[PDB]
Design a protein around this nucleic acid. Structure first.
Ligand SMILES: [Mg+2]
Ligand SMILES: [Zn+2]
Ligand SMILES: [Zn+2]
Ligand SMILES: [Zn+2]
Lengths: 112, 539, 81, 171, 142, 262, 97, 131
RNA sequence: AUCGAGAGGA
DNA sequence: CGCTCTGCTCCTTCTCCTTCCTCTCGATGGCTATGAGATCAACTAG
DNA sequence: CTAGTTGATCTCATATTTCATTCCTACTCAGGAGAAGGAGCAGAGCG
């Protein structure tokens, strides 16, 4: 129910200004804030204190403190995030990079 | 050379002191960074990153260009506390049996049994700390929950545990019957913690052990991390870290000196604190307590933490967002006679930005003409790259009329018409404010945009500026021309509405034009019809 | 798992963009062109022509979140964009 | 010594070779960096068992450029030394302080420090063989050596041979 | 061990003699592939011919490798080589030990134990004495 | 701050929405799996109007005189009148609409009958009329049976999820539950014969177009939905706002707590 | 010019993965380093003139890989190195399927 | 002149409208103190404008000083900002020859054209009164 | 060159 | 009913905290020495 | 191949000891909200 109330609440703020934003964009935001069975804020004490990739979490507002915790706990990062591939200068697994391209030898050799 | 791979995962951890000793290529012993031009082998020696023109870099050659640094080594006379782990160190000692090597609690208590069942390592010991911190005794015999009359002889020490309080860079243990905890004793007890106890505490036996939280040997960052300095006329003006490392070296040398000779016990105690203080601030010069390190010039010393913390650090200021090349910035003006996806680019700007087109049978004839023109005329190139990478400069050679192109070569072609490019208005608030435009070269010094495309940018011709970014590869070109192309963002997902339209005088002009009272003579009509580029020639 | 592939049969815009970019990049490297030449010197026009007649010899590997993947031939993918 | 194992190799192919001929051209490529190769894990790779039935497992296009990458698998024959291994090999060249002897595909340096002290260098012999004792070792004569470890090098793999032992003498 | 085909294959300690047999087989296989596209003296030259046409002769070491292996080959006739396979492998010997016995010349168990440290502490001397005599006579047949 | 929280939320090829960890956030993007750029406000007729107004616009009876279909509308006139087989289909259709009418009331308590939905059906129909100048003054060649089966056939091809399992199939029906209710409203038997005097050639073209139009509007997997949503929320904030700062931050000690008791 | 955070955020919305990588590596900071397979550390002695590689402390001369990363990233690791942290980089995912 | 940009009479510029000068004085010092430090500027062996004045002098410490002033003429150009006395700032959208401009009966030709749409949204009725 | 501060513009 | 216990609430401490671009000015960057004795190496020639 | 002589280069005690080793903080000036740990208290169970 709080998820519905949160949506009904933020909708008022945006609607009050006279601007209109689609249902999806507001719906996604409240859903992310309540996947943990609770209102996870977007502050350093909210979203940041999550289990997401350690390297991605460092860059938001707390960096040196975060690295120590990851280093002390021997945290392993899977590099499945966006920032990780940005830091390491690789193609992020998003958009055009969410898949892979293979050479079809069977079709290529077939097409003579 | 070696196989090429891409990083799949990152594993964090702490250096094992033996690992630090092994990785290093030189032992640092002298605070001196210099005599006249030679460099002392005890610091910044050739075994680290050599200075330019010196292809040594511990036999890596390559100068500073293609050779990274190689780490040094320092062996502290007395171990010191790592600053970042002070809080965790306090937490850990609050749970270990304090010179018995075990945990204060044990599986025989139901409360912690649930804590041990917690899958999250970070939350695991947090729950444990809430329990063991309150236990002030590690009695050998603990009654069993299943059998109250039966006790388990676990606690080797069986004595009480002091209340541990943080005081500056040191911890004080108030025994319930009061002294400063000794750094050495922490290593002993931590070394006595069983591997099984690591897991309950969230550590990793091969990447993070409690004893490694105490520094016994300092890794020495190589010169590139603290680049050799030439701000002034042969004046060193070296980086702060070099000065700070020398300061620690001075302290470290003194500490062993006092202990080795004379042994003025009390003087050794303060000497250790100075070593602890200098090392502590060297990594983080921002602590809760008063102590703030000040450079000889009078400004605070910029520890490593400052180089990373906050904006302008290595992460936000140099990794997430960074200075880029192949870009231009100038003022914008309107042009009704310019299509949406098109944009006017100054010849001067177009004459400097380049694109490395590959020589192929389809364009070897055309590219040759551009080379013949040279970098002076607009439709030309600046550099020609051979197969081996010999970056020919057309500016400083008459060979522009002599060079012969070969398939596989790259030509730094000038930006020409219809080349996809990316605009950007600061701030880039939302998606519509970064779109890919086609190029038309305009003979003036300002970007020319269509009017109807100003709305998505939130732009205005009152003196605004736009940044221009040019892709350097065919694949990047395709995505700009297939994803960021202006016509593809006509409908904005923001509000389901077309983010663009007819605005300003054109919007007002149509209203007058389409009134029921407006009529057009024959002479006027013919001119209007011709202005339509898609007209079929039928009146 | 070629049997009962649960992904869409259409050609995702991102897939179209990346396939066109990769094919144009290969063409710029003097790769064997599989379609007749109509004077389109630019590699990207050749790539679009190749995609129009399903003459691109490539297969996409769509990755599902768990780590599995599905191989879709560029020929079978339905281009509706 | 000699073993058979299923090895894997990653091969990068330039786009220009994307003709149908690639199917066999890639196989051809395999040969020039599998035939007679050097490695510290398997020793020397001599030949590829099951030359046909080449494993390709589909090519992956590097996102950087058009060059493709194939993780070819193949059964291969390798030769690997072991500590204390006795081998009957031949002598290639003599030396002042020992011999150089060929053990199949690998080289073994039979040093003077590890032959019996009664066996001494004879400068007057042609070739300069060791003939002061019964263990007459020369280029044209066979030899039996013991491998006291293998000091493998990046470019090649060579071991140390000894005759200061009861068995595995000259010839 | 496990191969790259998904099969748990044991360490194939290939004997020197059977190693020569399989290299010959692979060479003839390559020869047919291009077509589409026993005393030591005879074997040494015949295999040298095989190597000299399958390749360009640049890899001289392999010819030096292959030639001397024939010179020291102890079981050249593949038909009789089959005997020493089941004779050695069927006894439960370690494959490396089987390769050790099938590539060198030995006659008595004590010599095998001294030459092979692994067998010196766990081998049944009776089996070694019986087989080594048999292989010793078999070796002379070549 | 808002972007970093939603930076790594992407639509995966399974059509769900996940973050970097793989945690599921929305089992279907936006609860319908439709790209925002292909949506637009459309009117749901079955919601508004009085019961009689709804009845006279949709109810068709081949037996009684209240809802008699005019024979002049169709080439087949009295042949349809009195046909019980066709009458059963109309009763099922009318009952189907009746369920939708009372169903949508629960979904939209306020009764608002203008909501964003994919595929502007009205525009397609108008294009169909002008496409080949359908003559609106002659009987049509369509049949009641063809209209009913054709519409039902269309609902089967509106595939947002491709899995053959019960869970996917159950979700698939839910995804297009609102959109199909719009189809049955504007493709009703009476409307397609009286208001929209289409022909056999038109009707087949219209249905085939809706399917193509609908599928093209499906959200493309790989879309970076997370950033796209955060930017959309943030940008109007540049134009109440302290309250927004009070929402993103939990701010338990709010400024103006209030209750609305009915 | 600076390719700020919002500048990359817009491209992430566009999904242009290749362009974003190009803006951050080819445009600037492109750098090649060698990594020990045993330890994900940039402590490989690469005598490239002689094709000789080594990792003192691991005695590894066979397991080396090249990785292209921003020069700024190399610093970030090396400053973490000096801070007693070990950002070990591995080119093989622990979990396959 | 759709947005705040404006159309300007090219021939008006040629006759001297909004012409401007621009001075930019450079500086350099002789050397540091005398403890084995010296440097001079006597043409050692191996912006856009003219030199206005080269001033050679010495500070109170006896060090030779050189101040060079270079002037240049900056003519109005497309994109150069202009503004009235009411916050109506804008840039030269384009320049037209005199013949192309609209002209009154008397032959007076405008020196500057600005967009009507700037008036209502900005509510600069004071600007109209001044005109 | 460096940091440091100030002014100003988008 | 007094002892003791423990959670529970309460009430301090105690941190730790915010687009893009162009100019100008200005303080400071700064090391510690003397050569000379004695050791290594560079050149040279038989 | 190698001893010799002399350029070059590493390491140290000789000279200057001079003249006192700066000060005392002042000042207000922003700041707010959340997290941590001590402290008290009181009823609940126990002796
Ligand atoms: Mg403006
Ligand atoms: Zn180096
Ligand atoms: Zn203890
Ligand atoms: Zn290593």
């Amino acid at each position: 129910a709080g998820r519905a109330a949160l949506y009904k609440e933020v909708y008022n703020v945006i609607a009050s200004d006279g601007s209109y934003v689609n249902y999806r964009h507001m719906a996604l935001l409240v859903d992310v804030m309540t996947t943990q069975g609770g209102l996870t804020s977007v502050t350093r004490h909210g979203f940041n204190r999550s289990n997401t990739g350690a390297l991605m979490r460092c860059s938001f507002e707390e960096t040196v403190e975060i690295l120590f915790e990851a280093g002390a706990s021997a945290e392993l990062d899977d590099c499945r995030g966006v920032s990780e591939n940005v830091i390491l200068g690789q193609m992020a697994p998003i958009g055009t990079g969410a898949f892979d391209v293979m050479i079809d030898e069977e079709s290529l050799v077939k097409y003579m | 050379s070696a196989p090429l791979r891409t990083v799949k995962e990152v594993q964090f951890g702490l250096f094992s002191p033996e690992e630090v000793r092994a990785i290093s290529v030189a032992k640092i012993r002298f605070p001196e960074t210099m005599q006249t031009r030679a460099k002392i082998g005890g610091l910044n020696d050739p075994r680290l990153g050599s200075i330019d023109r010196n292809l040594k870099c511990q036999t890596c050659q390559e100068g500073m260009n293609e050779c990274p640094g190689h780490f040094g080594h320092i062996d502290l006379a007395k171990p010191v506390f790592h600053v970042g782990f002070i809080a965790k160190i306090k937490k850990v000692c609050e749970c270990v049996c304090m010179h018995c090597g075990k945990l204060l609690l044990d599986e025989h208590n139901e409360l912690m049994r649930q804590a041990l069942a917690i899958k999250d390592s970070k939350k695991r010991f947090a729950a444990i700390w809430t329990l063991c911190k309150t236990k002030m005794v590690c009695e050998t015999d603990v009654p069993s929950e299943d059998d109250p009359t039966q006790l388990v002889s676990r606690g080797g020490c069986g004595n009480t545990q002091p209340t541990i309080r943080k005081d500056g860079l040191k911890l004080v243990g108030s025994w319930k019957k009061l002294r400063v905890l000794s750094t050495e004793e922490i290593l002993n007890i931590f070394k006595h913690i069983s591997v099984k106890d690591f897991t309950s505490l969230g550590f990793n036996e091969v990447f993070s052990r409690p004893e490694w939280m105490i520094l016994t040997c300092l890794p020495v960052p190589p010169p590139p991390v603290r680049p050799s300095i030439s701000f002034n006329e042969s004046q060193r003006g070296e980086d702060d870290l070099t000065f700070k490392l020398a300061d620690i070296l001075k302290a470290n040398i003194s500490l062993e000196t006092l202990e080795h000779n004379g042994a003025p016990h009390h003087a050794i105690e303060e000497a250790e604190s100075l070593l602890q203080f200098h090392v502590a601030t060297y990594m983080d010069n921002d602590i809760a307590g008063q102590p703030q390190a000040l450079q000889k010039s009078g400004r605070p010393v910029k520890s490593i933490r400052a180089r990373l913390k906050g904006k302008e650090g290595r992460i936000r200021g140099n990794l997430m967002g960074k200075r880029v090349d192949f870009s231009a910035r100038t003022v914008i003006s309107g042009d009704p006679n310019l299509e949406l996806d098109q944009v006017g680019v100054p010849k001067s700007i177009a004459k400097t930005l380049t694109y490395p087109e590959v020589v192929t049978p389809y364009n070897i004839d055309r590219l040759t003409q551009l080379v013949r023109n040279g970098p002076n005329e607009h439709p030309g190139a600046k550099y020609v790259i051979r197969d081996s990478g010999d970056r020919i400069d057309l500016r400083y050679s008459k060979r522009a009329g002599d060079i012969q192109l070969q398939y596989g070569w790259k030509v730094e072609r000038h930006i020409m018409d219809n080349d996809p490019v990316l605009f950007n208005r600061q701030p880039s608030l939302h998606k519509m404010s970064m779109m890919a435009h086609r190029v038309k070269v305009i003979p003036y010094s300002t970007f020319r945009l269509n009017l109807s495309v100003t709305s998505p940018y939130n732009a205005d011709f009152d003196g605004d500026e736009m940044n221009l970014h040019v892709p350097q590869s065919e694949e990047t070109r395709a995505e700009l021309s297939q994803l960021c192309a202006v016509p593809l963002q006509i409908v904005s997902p923001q509000s389901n509405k077309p983010c663009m339209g007819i605005v300003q005088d054109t919007l007002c002009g149509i209203r007058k034009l389409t009134l029921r009272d407006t009529f057009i003579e024959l002479d006027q009509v013919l001119n209007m019809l011709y202005w339509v580029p898609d007209w079929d020639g039928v009146i | 798992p070629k049997d009962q592939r649960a992904t869409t049969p259409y050609m995702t815009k991102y897939e179209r963009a990346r396939i066109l970019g990769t094919r144009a990049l290969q063409i710029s490297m003097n790769a064997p062109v599989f379609v007749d030449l109509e004077g389109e010197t630019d590699p990207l026009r050749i790539a679009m022509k190749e995609l129009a007649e399903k003459k691109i010899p490539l297969v996409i590997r769509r990755y599902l979140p768990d780590g599995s993947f599905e191989d879709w031939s560029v020929e079978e993918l339905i281009v509706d964009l | 010594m000699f073993f058979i194992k299923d090895l894997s190799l990653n091969i990068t192919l330039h786009p220009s070779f994307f003709g149908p001929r690639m199917k066999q051209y890639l196989k051809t490529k395999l040969l020039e960096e599998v035939e007679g190769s050097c490695t510290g894990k398997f020793g020397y790779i001599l030949c590829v068992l099951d030359y046909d039935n080449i494993d390709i497992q589909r090519g992956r296009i590097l996102p950087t450029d058009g060059s493709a990458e194939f993780n070819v698998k193949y059964r291969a024959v390798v030769f690997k030394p072991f500590k204390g291994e006795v081998v009957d090999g031949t002598v290639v060249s003599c030396s002042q302080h020992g011999f150089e002897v060929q053990v199949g595909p690998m080289k073994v340096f039979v040093t003077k420090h590890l032959m019996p002290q009664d066996l001494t260098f004879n400068a007057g012999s042609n070739p300069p063989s060791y003939q002061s004792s019964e263990d007459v070792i020369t280029i044209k004569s066979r030899i039996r050596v013991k491998i006291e470890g293998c000091i493998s090098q990046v470019s090649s793999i060579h071991a140390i041979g000894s005759i200061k032992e009861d068995y595995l003498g000259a010839i | 061990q496990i191969n790259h085909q998904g099969e748990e294959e044991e360490l194939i300690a290939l004997n020197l003699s059977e190693a020569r047999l399989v290299i010959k087989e692979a060479l003839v296989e390559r020869r047919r592939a291009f077509k589409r596209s026993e005393t030591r003296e005879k074997e040494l030259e015949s295999i040298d011919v095989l190597l000299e046409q399958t390749t360009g002769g640049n890899n001289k070491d392999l010819k030096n490798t292959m030639q001397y292996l024939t010179n020291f080959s102890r079981f050249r006739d593949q038909e009789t080589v089959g005997a020493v396979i089941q004779l050695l492998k069927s006894t439960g010997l370690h494959p490396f030990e089987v390769a050790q016995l099938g590539s060198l010349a030995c006659d008595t168990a004590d010599e095998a134990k001294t030459l092979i440290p692994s067998l010196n502490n766990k081998i049944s001397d009776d089996e070694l004495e019986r087989i080594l005599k048999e292989l010793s006579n078999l070796e002379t047949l070549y | 701050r808002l972007v970093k929280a939603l930076e790594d939320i992407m639509v995966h090829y399974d059509n769900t929405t996940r973050n970097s960890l793989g945690n599921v956030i929305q089992f279907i993007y936006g609860e319908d799996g439709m790209d925002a750029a292909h949506i637009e406000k459309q009117s749901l007729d079955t919601i508004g109007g009085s019961d009689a107004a709804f009845e006279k616009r949709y109810r068709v009876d081949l037996l009684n005189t209240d809802h008699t279909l005019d024979p002049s509308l169709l080439e087949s006139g009295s042949e349809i009148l009195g046909d019980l087989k066709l009458q059963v289909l109309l009763d099922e259709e009318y009952k189907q609409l009746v369920k939708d009418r009372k169903f949508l009331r629960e979904v939209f308590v306020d009764g608002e009958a203008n909501w964003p939905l994919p595929v502007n059906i009205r525009r397609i129909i108008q294009n169909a009329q002008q496409t080949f100048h359908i003559d609106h003054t002659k009987p049509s060649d369509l049949t009641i049976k063809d209209i009913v089966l054709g519409v039902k056939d269309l609902q089967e091809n509106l595939l947002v999820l491709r899995g053959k399992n019960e869970i996917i199939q159950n979700a698939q029906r839910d995804a297009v539950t609102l959109f199909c209710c719009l189809l049955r409203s504007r493709l009703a038997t009476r409307r397609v014969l009286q208001e929209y005097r289409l022909t056999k050639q038109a009707f087949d073209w219209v249905l085939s177009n809706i399917e193509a139009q609908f599928l093209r509007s499906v959200v493309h997997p790989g879309e970076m939905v997370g950033v796209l949503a955060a930017q959309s929320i943030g940008e109007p904030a540049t134009q109440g706002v302290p309250r927004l700062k009070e929402i993103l931050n939990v701010a338990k000690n709010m400024k103006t707590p209030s209750l609305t008791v009915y | 010019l600076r390719f700020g955070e919002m500048e990359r955020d817009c491209m992430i919305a566009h999904g242009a993965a290749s362009f974003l990588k190009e803006r951050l590596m080819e445009a600037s900071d492109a750098f090649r380093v060698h990594i020990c397979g045993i330890c994900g550390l940039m402590t490989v002695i690469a005598k490239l003139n002689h094709n000789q590689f080594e990792c003192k402390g691991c005695d590894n001369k066979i397991d080396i890989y090249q990785i292209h990363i921003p020069y700024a990233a190399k610093l970030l690791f090396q400053e973490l190195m000096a801070m007693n942290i070990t950002p070990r980089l591995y080119t093989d995912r622990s979990r396959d399927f | 002149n759709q947005e705040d940009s404006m159309i300007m009479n090219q021939s008006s510029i040629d006759r001297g409208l909004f012409r401007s000068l621009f001075f930019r004085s450079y500086m350099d010092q002789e050397k540091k103190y005398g403890m084995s430090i010296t440097e001079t500027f006597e043409k050692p062996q191996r912006e856009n404008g003219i030199v206005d004045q080269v001033l050679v002098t010495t500070n109170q410490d006896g060090l030779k000083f050189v101040k060079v002033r270079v002037r240049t003429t900056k003519i109005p150009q497309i994109g150069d900002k202009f503004a009235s006395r009411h916050g109506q700032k804008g840039t030269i959208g384009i320049t037209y020859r005199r013949e192309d401009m609209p002209f009154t009966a008397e032959g007076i030709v405008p020196d500057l054209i600005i967009n009507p749409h700037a008036i209502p949204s900005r509510m600069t009725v004071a600007h109209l009164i001044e005109c």
